[PDB]
Structures are given as C-alpha cells and as structure tokens.
Point group: D2
Chain length 128, copies 4
C-alpha cells in the first residue's frame, strides 16, 4: 500500500517538471525514516550543465529540512523501461543512503524495477 502511494507521488511530479529544453520529465519520491516524503522534479537551465535531476531535487529538499535518514526512493519516467537514475543522482544517493536502501524505478505501462543503492552504485566513492 505504501509503495503504491510513493509511486503515485513520483508520477505526479511528472506534471511539475521544469523541462522546457528536453521535454523529458522525471519524478521522484524520497521516503524518510518517519515516512514523510519529499517530492523531486527535474529543473533544467538554459545552460544544460546546471540542470538538476528529480532525484537530487528530492534529496536537496529533504536535506535542507534536516533529513538524513532515508528508507526508500521511487523514481518515475515516461519511458519504455523503468527510468534509470543517472550517475550524478546515484552519487548523491550514496552520500545520504545506506547501500541496502531499496530503490523502485518505474516506467510506462506499469513497468517496474526493484533495485538498491548498492546495486546502482557498486564500490561507491564516499567520504571514507
């Protein structure tokens, strides 16, 4: 039940995207230790390199409000296969999430992929 709600939150973010250059929305639902969620949207810039992905938007929102303990991340796109977080997003994930933290990826027609931080970013570069 909870996972279905998180998926709906990530999907709803697709209509909150700021993507006037790619027209490629991505949505995220980041779940905290308490179960409160932070929604992420893609936010582009005319200089493409300053674009901020939905996953990172969710982390920056949560971390700015003092969140440091995360239990799940859901990411959605309008894609034939489940949306894949880019490497920059995976690196921010690794800063704040345990390797075992589950990640649910969804795409068109209900396609889903169950994964984890450890699986998305093996041998991760960290403060360590």
């Amino acid at each position: 039940e909870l996972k279905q709600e998180w998926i709906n939150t990530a999907i709803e973010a697709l209509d909150k995207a700021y993507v006037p250059y790619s027209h490629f929305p991505v949505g995220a639902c980041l779940v905290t230790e308490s179960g409160k969620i932070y929604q992420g949207i893609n936010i582009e810039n005319a200089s493409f390199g300053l674009t901020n992905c939905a996953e990172r938007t969710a982390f920056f929102k949560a971390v700015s409000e003092g969140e440091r303990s995360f239990t799940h991340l859901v990411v959605a796109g309008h894609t034939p296969d489940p949306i894949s977080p880019c490497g920059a997003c995976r690196q921010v994930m690794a800063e704040f999430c345990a390797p075992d933290m589950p990640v649910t990826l969804v795409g068109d027609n209900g396609v889903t992929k169950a994964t984890t931080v450890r699986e998305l970013l093996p041998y991760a570069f960290t403060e360590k």
Copy 2:
C-alpha cells in the same frame, strides 16, 4: 529583517562536512512565501549544491515562478558573493531587476540585483 534572519539562521543547518563553509539563502515569492536554502556538499566536490540553488529548487518544485527577493549569507568579512552557477540559476527564474541582498558577518550587507550580478545573461 526576517529574510536576513532566515538566511543567517540557515548557516547552522548547512551540510558542509568537507569545506566547513556554510552558506544560507532566503528566496521570497511575490506572494510573500519564504524558501530557505543551505549548501549541500558531496564527497565528490563537483556534485555540491549551493544554498541559493537549493532555495530555488525548493520553490520551483512547489510551483513557484514569481520571485521578488533573494538574500544570501555567509560567515565572511565582506558580504558573500554568489558564484556564477547560482547567478545563472537566478537568471533562469528571476527578472533582471529583482533585488539581491548579500550578507556577511557583523551585519555587513551589499545591495545588488540580478542584472548587476549577471550582465548580458545567457538565456533562452
């Protein structure tokens, strides 16, 4: 003063385990809503996000598109200077005439604007 206080109080909440250089931001909408930003570093420095951009990403994620003021604060002898990446995100979302207040330690402030910080801006 409330906007200055929001930016300064953010300094004690920043995620800066690598620089120990906190930056705070207060982004104000036309409706008067306040969005607070902090800098959020990463073990890979290039993935660090500035306080100004954190505030914009928060506000834009909640549908805000009309901004009337930005305050940026640091623990600096002179009023802190927004970096060029932050200025480019300001230009994406703010009118050139939108005022920007820069703050440092011991009450020092500098009044500026989007137009002055990023002249001949790269745009759409």
Copy 3:
C-alpha cells in the same frame, strides 16, 4: 582573427546530439598557445560541459596558468553569452582585466572582460 577562426571552426566539431546548439571557444595563453574548446553534452543534461570550460580544462591540464584572451562563438544572432558557470571558471584562472571576445553569426562581435562578466566575483 586566428582566435576568432579557432572558436568558429570548433562549432562544426561540438558534441551536441541533444541540443544541436554548438559552442566554440579559443583560450590564449601569455606565451601565445591556443586551446580550443567545444561543448560536450551528456544524456543527463546536468553533466554537460561548456566549450569555455573544455578549453580551460585542456589548458590547465597542460600546466597553463597565464591566460590573455578568451574567444567564445555560437550560431547566434547576437554575440553568444557565456553562462555563469563558465564565468566562474574564468574567474578561477584569469585576471579581472583579461579581455573576452564574444562572437555570433554574420560577423557580430562583443568586446568584454572577466570583470564585466562576473562582477564582485566569488573567490578564494
């Protein structure tokens, strides 16, 4: 003219499969050495690198630290504007007085400087 030609000729070599918006750069050292930059996009747009920054990274990787001119070109009606991220990298490595020539289509040019593009720069 050679510096302008280097920046314009880079436009046909850019890696821009997503924007199809090429940008070229020519970075000149005090010794007269030329470094050419192109923009290099990524499927994740946020990992895109601008032509100006490509030129700086090339030059700095070869030990260059003294820069006397930067030319930036685009296929634009007015002279192309460096984004704020590029301006911040210029400020890392260039004196405020270093001249910057901006170029667009049909011979349009704009003369500027690091100091004018990024006033009150965030620094060391």
Copy 4:
C-alpha cells in the same frame, strides 16, 4: 607492458592536479582506439560544484579532439583502496564507452582493482 605505462600516466597526473581546496589529487589515463592516451587531472573551483574530476577532464580533452572510441581507462589516487570513480564520472564514461570497456583503478602500495563500465554503472541511463 601497456597497462603499466597507463598506470604511470595516471600516477603522473597526481602532480598536475589543481586541488587547492581538497588537496586530494586524482589522475586518469584514457586510452583511445589507436592507443594514443589522454591524461586527466582534477580541477577544482572555489565554488565546489564546478569542480571537474580527472576522469571527466580526460574525456573532455579526448572528445574535444574528435575521439569517440575508447579501449581502457586507468584512474589513480593516493588512497588505501583503489580509487573509486564518482557517479558523475561514471555517467560520462557511459556516454562514450562500451559497457565492456575495462577500467583499472589503483591506490597506495600498488593496490589495484579490475573493473568495467558495466560493473561501475549497471543499468546505465543513456540516450537510448
């Protein structure tokens, strides 16, 4: 023999770093289809988010000179375990390199890790 030369190139980049903020050098040796190499260095900025990693510096050098076919990447750091490319670097790797392209990571005391693009960035986000 060739791999030892690439490792020396990546190690030599450690003395070409521009890292006045972290004092954490990273070196890279990117090998093209012809065997010509591009050396990468870490290049920091006072605004940390504009820092460019050694791996990406090597790719940007090579790609600016028309290179699009890469056969190996070596990365070096002064680290107890073999240096780990961050996720941003892995994402640029995936733009230009085949999943099977080998990656050699080295650290202090000759420690080495043999890996690949597919292993560093599974289920990679791409143009596809």
